[PDB]
Design a protein around this ligand. Structure first.
Ligand SMILES: C[C@H]1O[C@@H](O[C@H]2[C@@H](O)C[C@H](O[C@H]3[C@@H](O)C[C@H](O[C@H]4CC[C@@]5(C)[C@H](CC[C@@H]6[C@@H]5C[C@@H](O)[C@]5(C)[C@@H](C7=CC(=O)OC7)CC[C@]65O)C4)O[C@@H]3C)O[C@@H]2C)C[C@H](O)[C@@H]1O
Ligand SMILES: *[C@@H]1O[C@H](CO)[C@@H](O[C@@H]2O[C@H](CO)[C@@H](O)[C@H](O)[C@H]2NC(C)=O)[C@H](O)[C@H]1NC(C)=O
Ligand SMILES: *[C@@H]1O[C@H](CO)[C@@H](O[C@@H]2O[C@H](CO)[C@@H](O)[C@H](O)[C@H]2NC(C)=O)[C@H](O)[C@H]1NC(C)=O
Ligand SMILES: CC(C)CCC[C@@H](C)[C@H]1CC[C@H]2[C@@H]3CC=C4C[C@@H](O)CC[C@]4(C)[C@H]3CC[C@]12C
Ligand SMILES: CC(C)CCC[C@@H](C)[C@H]1CC[C@H]2[C@@H]3CC=C4C[C@@H](O)CC[C@]4(C)[C@H]3CC[C@]12C
Ligand SMILES: CC(C)CCC[C@@H](C)[C@H]1CC[C@H]2[C@@H]3CC=C4C[C@@H](O)CC[C@]4(C)[C@H]3CC[C@]12C
Ligand SMILES: *[C@@H]1O[C@H](CO)[C@@H](O)[C@H](O)[C@H]1NC(C)=O
Ligand SMILES: [Mg+2]
Ligand SMILES: [Mg+2]
Ligand code: NA
Lengths: 996, 32, 291
């Protein structure tokens, strides 16, 4: 009965914060100023569990090893090995001197699955081994007030209903209920997704427990100020606890690559049992008994199983995963490497993933003119004109009138990614001055501060006064900053290029429109002004104490507005554009304010410049918003408050009739519903996030991508891919590699599937025409697990035939990894020519040694006999047993060589699916080495001392090595003209029937 | 007698070719 | 999803009718061209070989040594009383010697009377077709004394003390070369070393050599071997109805109700052996006359 437990977690949380202080004191029974007694503390601590998320479900190493020993591809080889021991059981107990070929093969198939499990397991486990090196769990302490005394205990030693105090810089331990605030600003970024530092007030503000201000949250950090509260929720019953436990209990789904592998096995066994059954019935119709026919059935079906294709595909995926690890893109799953390419809808998180999740100085308003600043994390953009008097004024208004400085170790760290204490706004301003205006150390101490006036609770303004060390004027310098409404009410002078002017409305309205431009853009604007103090009314000894009116509040000189916002990450816009360039539907999913979400969406590409929403049209026509037709709005913003009152059909409609969607104010449990909505269409979903709100989303999606450093640990663990460097362009890299490895995979499949026809046809016509065995078992192993290993792996190294980032994403119902065209090529045409080429060399060796092909009919009866040492050929010669068996084995060896020779041309025609070998180019050095290794290995398996003994692969007369050349060249020419007709005729006969 | 094939000549030659074709591919994958 | 059989928009087994015809026609033309190509190349291959000689003859360098009772495991186990116990043997012996009767070798245009004494080799020119159909030297059953008889349709053979004739593997152009007069300890044999290929039987270990008491050999004129006047072979095309030499071996003093191993080793310079092929040159048999 765990279904009800998960269902009670998918629902949005409820609370009881909206209570009076006396009612709360009665419900929890705790002194609001002294707290509770330590006895009651330990009494609860040993009553419901310590304040800490219960550990994740430990995964023993033998479990995931056995996991790698199963699955889709491995299970096929398991039924094959079991069928080998079954056929061997039928062969041992029923006939004399049974041949050890079947058992010899069964153990090999088992070893194939086991070794593949060892390699793949060591790989997937290595990905988690480097993950255990990223958990830097520093046990932090909490400040709890108990028995009237403040004490710092461990966060796990905290109980329910106890007084807790926080200092600006501390992390909120458990979920509290704010009872006494003082300039408290917490960071609910990793949880609800609120970007700007949200303030916390003891009064009840909103019915929703998340948007309200009287609740402190788990894993949130106190940015500035102090606050008191009562611990309402502890342990897993917390907000982020109820989210983490939800992510740990959700389903993973089925990767698309796994579905393609399953369907591929379906076709493989579909034709395997078809040929095995039709030939079993045909064999019984001929002459063979049930005993023999069963062995034939098992042989035909098992032979149709690509034995080596398992490891070649596993390595094929591991190689592509290596390039992911090089670019700091870790994949915990060995198949999730491909999922980015088959993706068609990306649900990205705004704060932390799309944006830098850090307040930064956006624009300026110098000389009645907007000036955009560099808002990149690595500082690689256009710089504003920084050589004017208005700049030297404004920069000092920021470099002096600000309560923000650096810290101890902040000396070698970069200018932006360094720790700064104080307000987020003041930190951003300090950074922009420390970068675009020299330094602030000597620039701040050069002006000895006299008096300061901090921000007010009402009419927020921060002013101060400083001395003037300029060697041109010994007067004073008064500076002030504040909201753009506080500076407009206390100013009359205006600065321009160095001189002053009145507050003329012709330029004051020019200030108002510039305020609404930076305001409607989702940014927070600030005003900076200063005024000279006459040294004749306030000489260099008058200490204007902070009591009464000592400075001229009005007649100040305004320098310019300075807006700010959390900017998007560096390559995020270009990357989003690249995704849309391929056809990937980008949908922003965040729980922040729509005012900022829409602005950042416009600034990254999720909202195209020109497309309007249902509200934008109404605002453009001065008409009620409920009149316009939603079909006229290509894009739409969805307020999460409205999403609560929606059904499945409605969200389906939101995604069907709107191309650009922006979900705002969405709860963590709602992101799950959004992802499921995008999945109800039938498309592939990739959710990129960082905070804990993206944990259930990054878990239910087909693939979850978490940020490596700027993301929490819950969502990072519950994800399928991690961007260790937070470079969002790795998403574009991933989708490129996913489509690349998909097509290259098809090529490797067609390669290994082509060799099956010449591997099985000798045994088929062996039964029909009753000729001596043309191809042995060990030789087949030398082909599937020997020579063809390097070619198949080298085929994965092929590059793009055309621009893959241009074509639309693959359709899951139409574009399959193994379509019926591929089987018509490998099993149908190519492999058939290879089989004929092998039978050619067969008849060549036998006819040259005295057994003409016409005479080989019905000869296997006495040929396979061990004691008939007087078998007649076409010349009348009598061959013994070993003398004719030597010819049979030295006939298997050139058949093996023949397969290698035709596989040369097959590997080259498989290198290009649509292009020509001349167009593409033999630059795949892995493939070149594949051909040379394949050839030299085949030659070594024939001319080495003891091959005719260990493997019965006797040496070959040099004339045999050329019996396969015409068939190989034939295959090359036919497939080349096929790829040529597909080039000149993009119609579809040669395409829709063969082009796989 | 025609009932004898100098197998050692072809075998030794095939081994030398097998060694050369392998080391050539090795040099191929070592572009330096 | 697996009921794509048909629809009202024409699909059968997955595709339409016109598509089935297009694909079937293409595959028929394609496979027809493939068959024609394979046949043409196999024809060129047929043009690279002659009718009077196999190109490669090195895989039959050491000729074999077979026997008449092609036993399932080279073992002769029967009862001296029960006639049905040894029927499988006698049937094969009669069918083998059915082509050696005096009535079978009656045409004088294809048969030539070699002689009652083993003589030198008979080379009938080259192996080409410039000459007509070569002659085959006759070999009457009378040469194998005590293992031929003048019996009726059923050759009443030996129940006690059985007979096992040996035969040298027929090889084209092979000229047998008996060992030099400097015989390196070859188990007492007659002094007719120059015109007959010697073949001597023996046990296999100290036990088999003791159980087998006495052996009597029979051949052309009384020599235990094959006369050189019947070699070399000129192929089935140029010498049809050819009769290779035969030599019988009878085991008189055997230990009844005991399986004993016999190794009949043929000696000569052009006769090789093999530790892997117990039939190349030598020959093994497991006789057991259980009463
Ligand atoms: C009752 C009478 O029995 C009289 O003996 C007979 C009977 O007992 C009947 C008895 O037939 C055998 C024999 O012909 C040998 C004949 O042998 C063929 C089938 C069994 C094989 C072991 C063998 C060697 C290749 C091998 C198959 C098994 C397959 O599964 C393969 C492993 C398969 C692969 C699958 C894959 O994944 O890769 C390749 C391709 C072919 C294969 O490589 C060929 O299989 C046939 C079933 O021949 C004996 C001589 C004696 C007296 O007359 C007595 O009175
Ligand atoms: C062939 O078998 C006959 C028996 O039918 C053997 O004739 C006997 O020979 C011995 C001498 O070895 C005489 O003592 C007997 O009197 C003979 N008996 C008969 C009935 O003739 C003959 O020796 C055998 N031939 C060979 C070459 O061993
Ligand atoms: C044939 O073999 C028998 C043995 O089966 C020989 O006769 C035996 O000789 C030993 C003495 O060495 C006696 O102990 C046995 O009693 C004899 N048995 C019989 C049945 O006589 C006999 O000498 C052999 N004869 C020939 C010609 O080889
Ligand atoms: C031993 C002998 C008799 C077996 C004969 C099997 C031949 C006739 C079979 C084997 C595989 C078959 C082909 C398998 C693949 C294709 C593509 C498919 O979409 C239509 C059928 C078609 C075109 C088949 C035509 C007939 C075919 C070539
Ligand atoms: C249209 C053109 C290019 C096709 C011409 C066919 C050529 C390439 C084919 C036809 C017959 C073939 C030959 C058939 C006979 C022999 C002898 C044999 O023991 C080895 C193979 C060898 C040496 C073949 C080499 C390639 C060959 C000459
Ligand atoms: C299509 C072309 C470019 C591929 C080049 C590779 C060909 C020409 C090479 C690959 C393997 C080679 C063979 C390797 C083995 C033998 C046995 C040796 O004792 C004599 C040479 C001989 C008979 C070679 C003939 C040439 C050969 C067939
Ligand atoms: C072999 O030597 C013997 C004497 O040792 C002699 O009688 C016989 O004629 C010789 N045979 C040949 C062919 O030289
Ligand atoms: Mg986030
Ligand atoms: Mg295979
Ligand atoms: Na997952």
């Amino acid at each position: 009965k765990e279904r009800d437990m998960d269902e009670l977690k998918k629902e949005v949380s409820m609370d009881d914060h909206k209570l009076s202080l006396d009612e709360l004191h009665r419900k929890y029974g705790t002194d609001l100023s002294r707290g509770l007694t330590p006895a009651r503390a330990a009494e609860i601590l040993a009553r419901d569990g310590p304040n800490a998320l219960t550990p994740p479900p430990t995964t023993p190493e033998w479990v995931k090893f056995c996991r790698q020993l199963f699955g889709g591809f491995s299970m096929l080889l398991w039924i094959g090995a079991i069928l080998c021991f079954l056929a061997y059981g039928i062969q041992a107990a029923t006939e004399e001197e049974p041949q050890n070929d079947n058992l010899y093969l069964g153990v090999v198939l088992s070893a194939v699955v086991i070794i593949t499990g060892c390699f793949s397991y060591y790989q997937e486990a290595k990905s988690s081994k480097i993950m255990e090196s990223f958990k830097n769990m520093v046990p932090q302490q909490a400040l709890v007030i108990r028995n009237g005394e403040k004490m710092s205990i461990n966060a796990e030693e905290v109980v329910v209903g106890d007084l807790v105090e926080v200092k600006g810089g501390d992390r909120i331990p458990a979920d509290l209920r704010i009872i006494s605030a003082n300039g408290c600003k917490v960071d609910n970024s990793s949880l609800t997704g609120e970007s700007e530092p949200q303030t916390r007030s003891p009064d009840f503000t909103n019915e929703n427990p998340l948007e309200t201000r009287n609740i402190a949250f788990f894993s949130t950090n106190c940015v500035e100020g102090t606050a008191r509260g009562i611990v309402v929720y502890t342990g897993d019953r917390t907000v982020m606890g109820r989210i983490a436990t939800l992510a740990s209990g959700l389903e993973g789904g089925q990767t698309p690559i796994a579905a393609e592998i399953e369907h591929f096995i379906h076709i493989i066994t579909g034709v395997a049992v078809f040929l095995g059954v039709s030939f079993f019935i045909l064999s019984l119709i001929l002459e063979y008994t049930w005993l023999e026919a069963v062995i034939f059935l098992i042989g035909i079906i098992v032979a149709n199983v690509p034995e080596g294709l398992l490891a070649t595909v596993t390595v094929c995926l591991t190689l592509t995963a290596k390039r992911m690890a090089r670019k700091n893109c870790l994949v915990k799953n060995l198949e999730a490497v491909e999922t980015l390419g088959s993706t068609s809808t990306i649900c990205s998180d705004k704060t932390g993933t799309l944006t830098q999740n850090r307040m930064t100085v956006a624009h300026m308003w110098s000389d009645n003119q907007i000036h955009e600043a560099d808002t990149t994390e690595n500082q690689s953009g256009v710089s504003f004109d920084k050589t004017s008097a208005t700049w030297l004024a404004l920069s000092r208004i920021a470099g002096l009138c600000n309560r923000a400085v650096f810290q101890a170790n902040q000396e070698n760290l970069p200018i932006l990614k360094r720790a700064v204490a104080g307000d987020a706004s003041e930190s951003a301003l300090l950074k922009c001055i420390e970068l675009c205006c020299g330094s602030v150390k000597e620039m701040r101490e050069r002006y000895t501060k006299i008096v300061e006036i901090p921000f007010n609770s009402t009419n927020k303004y921060q002013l101060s006064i400083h001395k003037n060390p300029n060697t041109a004027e010994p007067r004073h310098l008064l500076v002030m900053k504040g909201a753009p409404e506080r500076i407009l009410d206390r100013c009359s002078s205006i600065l321009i290029h160095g001189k002053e002017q009145p507050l003329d409305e012709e330029l004051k309205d020019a200030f108002q429109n510039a305020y609404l431009e930076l305001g409607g853009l989702g940014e927070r604007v600030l005003g900076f002004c200063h005024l000279f103090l006459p040294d004749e009314q306030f000489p260099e000894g008058f200490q204007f104490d902070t009591d009464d009116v000592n400075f001229p509040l009005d007649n100040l000189c305004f320098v310019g507005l300075i807006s700010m916002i959390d900017p998007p990450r560096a390559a995020v816009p270009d990357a989003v554009g690249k995704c849309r360039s391929a056809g990937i539907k980008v949908i922003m999913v965040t729980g922040d304010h729509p005012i900022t979400a829409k602005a950042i969406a416009k600034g990254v590409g999720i909202i195209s410049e020109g497309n309007e929403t249902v509200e934008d049209i109404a605002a453009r026509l001065n008409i009620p918003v409920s009149q316009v037709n939603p079909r006229d709005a290509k894009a739409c913003v969805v307020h999460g408050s409205d999403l609560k009152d929606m059904t499945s059909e409605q969200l389906d409609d939101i995604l069907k009739y709107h191309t650009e969607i922006v979900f705002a104010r969405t709860s963590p449990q709602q992101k799950l519903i959004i992802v499921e909505g995008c999945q109800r269409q039938g498309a592939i979903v990739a959710v990129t996030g960082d905070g804990v709100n993206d944990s259930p989303a990054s878990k239910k999606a087909d693939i979850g991508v978490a940020m490596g450093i700027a993301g929490s640990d819950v969502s990072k663990q519950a994800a399928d891919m991690i961007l260790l460097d937070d470079n969002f362009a790795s998403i574009v890299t991933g989708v490129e590699e996913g489509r690349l490895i998909f097509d290259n995979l098809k090529k490797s499949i067609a390669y290994t599937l082509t060799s099956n026809i010449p591997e099985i046809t000798p045994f088929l016509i062996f039964i029909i025409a009753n000729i001596p065995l043309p191809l042995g078992t060990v030789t087949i192993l030398c082909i599937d697990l020997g020579t063809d290993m390097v070619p198949a792996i080298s085929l994965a190294y092929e590059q793009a035939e055309s621009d893959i980032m241009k074509r639309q994403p693959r359709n899951p119902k139409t574009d399959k990894l193994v379509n019926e065209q591929l089987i018509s090529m490998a099993y149908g045409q190519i492999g058939m020519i290879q089989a004929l080429g092998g039978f050619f060399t067969y008849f060549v060796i036998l006819a040259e040694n005295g057994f003409l092909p016409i005479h080989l009919l019905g000869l296997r009866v006495n040929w396979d006999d061990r004691w008939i040492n007087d078998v007649e050929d076409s010349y009348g010669q009598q061959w013994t047993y070993e003398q004719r068996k030597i010819v049979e084995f030295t006939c298997h060896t050139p058949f093996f060589v023949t397969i290698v020779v035709v596989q040369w041309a097959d590997l080259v025609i498989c290198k290009t699916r649509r292009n020509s070998v001349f167009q593409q180019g033999m630059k795949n050095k892995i493939l070149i080495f594949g051909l040379f290794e394949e050839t030299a290995l085949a030659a070594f398996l024939s001319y080495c001392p003891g091959m005719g003994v260990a493997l019965r692969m006797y040496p070959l007369k040099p004339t045999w090595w050329f019996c396969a050349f015409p068939y190989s060249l034939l295959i090359f020419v036919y497939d080349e003209v096929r790829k040529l007709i597909i080039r000149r005729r993009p119609g579809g006969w040669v395409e829709k029937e063969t082009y796989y | 007698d025609p009932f004898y094939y100098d197998y050692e000549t072809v075998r030794n030659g095939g081994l030398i070719f097998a060694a050369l074709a392998f080391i050539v591919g090795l040099i191929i994958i070592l572009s330096k | 999803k697996k009921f794509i059989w048909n629809s009202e928009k024409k699909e059968f087994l997955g595709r339409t009718g016109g598509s089935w015809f297009k694909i079937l026609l293409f595959y028929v033309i394609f496979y027809g061209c493939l068959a024609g190509i394979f046949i043409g190349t196999i024809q060129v291959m047929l043009l690279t070989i002659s009718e009077f000689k196999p190109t490669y003859q090195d895989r039959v360098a050491p000729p074999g040594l077979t026997q008449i009772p092609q036993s399932q495991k080279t073992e002769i186990s029967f009862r001296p009383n029960d006639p049905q116990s040894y029927e499988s043997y006698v049937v094969s012996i009669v069918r083998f010697l059915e082509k050696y009767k005096d009535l079978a070798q009656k045409d004088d245009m294809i048969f030539e009377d070699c002689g009652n004494v083993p003589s030198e080799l008979k080379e009938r020119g080259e192996y080409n077709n410039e000459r007509g159909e070569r002659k085959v030297c006759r070999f009457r059953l009378e040469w194998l004394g005590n293992c031929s008889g003048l019996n009726d349709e059923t050759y009443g053979y030996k129940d006690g003390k059985p007979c096992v004739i040996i035969k040298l593997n027929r090889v084209l152009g092979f000229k047998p070369k008996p060992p030099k007069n400097e015989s390196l300890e070859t188990y007492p044999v007659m002094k007719y070393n120059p015109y007959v290929l010697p073949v001597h039987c023996t046990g296999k270990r100290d036990e088999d050599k003791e159980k087998v008491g006495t052996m009597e050999y029979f051949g052309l004129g009384g020599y235990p071997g094959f006369p050189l006047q019947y070699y070399p072979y000129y192929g089935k095309l140029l010498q049809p109805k050819y009769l290779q030499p035969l030599m019988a071996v009878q085991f008189t003093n055997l230990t009844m109700d005991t399986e004993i191993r016999i190794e009949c080793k043929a000696y000569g310079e052009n006769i090789g052996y093999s530790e892997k092929d117990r039939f190349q040159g030598r020959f093994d048999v497991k006789i057991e006359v259980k009463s």
